[PDB]
């Protein structure tokens, strides 16, 4: 509800295709979206979802659209190949919000991080710095078994929520084959 618009940030890195959870982290991702996009809808009957690839460069599949089936079908044919460019990834989702539908929709993007993340800190703070300037909260979900606790995003998420800025939270998953299921509950619950 609250007229929210989420711009999903899908991952398709080459090391993301190993099945350490169950049906490889491709169906694990597809089931993950299904339990969020539909969960993302059904609260306010005017919402919006958009899937963006974190492949080598600017790769966006579906834009801001109330429909639900387009994203799921468009998820297929997404076989992973290549490296992940996180720093230049969120900004692409950032612009999508700027050129949105009726601007009365709250803006948020959930991240779908995965295969080994690459960042140099500092810049990440700037990456989080700008988004926190303009009525934007991001939701990076730790996944794909990156470095334990992902102590590079840790300096990232806190920046957005800093100064008592309650909002989205970092979510991690056990390296073992823990089914995605409803395990993602920190943002959906109240954030």
């Amino acid at each position: 509800m609250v007229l929210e618009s989420t711009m999903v940030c899908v991952d398709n890195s080459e090391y993301m295709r190993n099945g350490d959870f169950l049906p490889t982290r491709l169906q694990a991702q597809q089931d993950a979206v299904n339990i969020v996009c539909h969960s993302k809808t059904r609260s306010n009957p005017e919402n919006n979802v958009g899937l963006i690839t974190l492949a080598n460069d600017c790769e966006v599949l579906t834009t801001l659209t109330p429909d639900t089936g387009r994203i799921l079908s468009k998820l297929h044919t997404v076989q992973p190949k290549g490296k992940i460019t996180f720093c230049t990834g969120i900004r692409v989702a950032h612009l999508a919000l700027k050129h949105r539908q009726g601007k009365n929709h709250k803006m948020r993007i959930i991240a779908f991080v995965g295969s080994p993340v690459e960042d140099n800190e500092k810049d990440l703070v700037k990456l989080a710095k700008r988004l926190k300037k303009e009525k934007v909260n991001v939701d990076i979900i730790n996944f794909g078994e990156e470095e334990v606790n992902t102590e590079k995003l840790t300096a990232f998420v806190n920046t957005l929520n800093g100064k008592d800025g309650t909002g989205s939270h970092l979510v991690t998953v056990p390296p073992g084959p823990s089914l995605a299921d409803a395990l993602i509950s920190s943002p959906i619950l109240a954030g």
């Binding site: 460069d57 966006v60 834009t63 659209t65 230049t88 900004r91 692409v92 612009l95 700027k98 050129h99």
Partner: protein, 286 residues
């Protein structure tokens, strides 16, 4: 590929309207849209254009957004109103052909396999035509970069349809080269042509400033064409060419002589025709 690209006045106007409609920022930003039109006998025609949302941060020009759904959804609207017009390319103000506009063409290559991008300035204060049309051509080499893909220019001119011309000329009612004869030619091609030649020559001189302060390490190919340009300069006017010129420049003067003489005779008879008129009127009156 395509020999030429003709740009209708409506498309030219819908781009100026687009910039002012969104250009409230003021300082600077390009504007990008999708062109529509049709072609016959390998000659493109662009008639209608609609604005596609597009933003891009200045630093690290590898980030930008173009709404595919907006492109697909709206084209359904334009298809219904007019089926003949189908996507043929894209336009953007982009006075300097920004670098990132070589992967954007790949984005639009889906809808039109052979698309053309026409750069049309929204703030022109100049002498040349404000419509450059480029097409994508591919060739990889070992000099520039492992990934080689560059635009090739196609001559572009401003067209006119029967309906548009009526409005366009009505909208001006400002200045026209009335009595289009020796007066317009001496100004519409001779003086203007010299102005253009100087500017293009000055453009070549500006690039050659790299001789002292290197900007790019000698493009090589640019030099090759420049060498061929000099060799093509007309041979010195001292040999049998001079006789050939006189035997033709003077030959054209005879026709001018004959035309002038006929003009005088007709002018003299006209004065006689009129002069006898008032003499006859005056004589009868008094």
């Amino acid at each position: 590929a395509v020999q030429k690209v003709v740009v209708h006045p409506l498309v030219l106007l819908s781009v100026v309207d687009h910039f002012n409609r969104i250009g409230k920022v003021g300082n600077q930003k390009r504007v990008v849209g999708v062109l529509l039109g049709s072609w016959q006998k390998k000659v493109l025609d662009v008639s209608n254009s609609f604005a596609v949302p597009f933003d891009e941060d200045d630093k690290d020009d590898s980030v930008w957004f173009l709404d595919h759904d907006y492109l697909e959804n709206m084209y359904g609207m334009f298809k219904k109103v007019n089926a003949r017009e189908r996507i043929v390319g894209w336009y953007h103000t982009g006075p300097k052909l920004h670098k990132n506009d070589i992967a954007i063409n790949e984005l639009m290559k889906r809808y039109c396999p052979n698309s053309v991008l026409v750069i049309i300035d929204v703030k022109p204060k100049d002498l040349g035509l404000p419509t450059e049309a480029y097409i994508s051509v591919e060739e990889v080499h070992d000099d520039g970069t492992p990934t080689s893909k560059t635009f090739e220019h196609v001559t572009s001119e401003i067209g006119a349809e029967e309906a548009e011309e009526v409005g366009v000329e009505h909208l001006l009612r400002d200045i026209k080269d009335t009595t289009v004869g020796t007066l317009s030619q001496r100004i519409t091609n001779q003086v203007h042509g010299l102005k253009g030649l100087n500017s293009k020559l000055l453009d070549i001189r500006s690039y050659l400033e790299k001789v002292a302060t290197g900007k790019l390490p000698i493009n090589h190919q640019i030099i090759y064409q420049l060498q061929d340009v000099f060799n093509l300069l007309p041979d010195v006017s001292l040999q049998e060419f001079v006789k050939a010129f006189y035997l033709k420049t003077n030959d054209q003067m005879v026709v001018v002589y004959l035309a002038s003489l006929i003009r005088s005779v007709v002018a003299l008879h006209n004065l006689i025709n009129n002069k006898i008129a008032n003499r006859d009127a005056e004589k009868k009156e008094g």
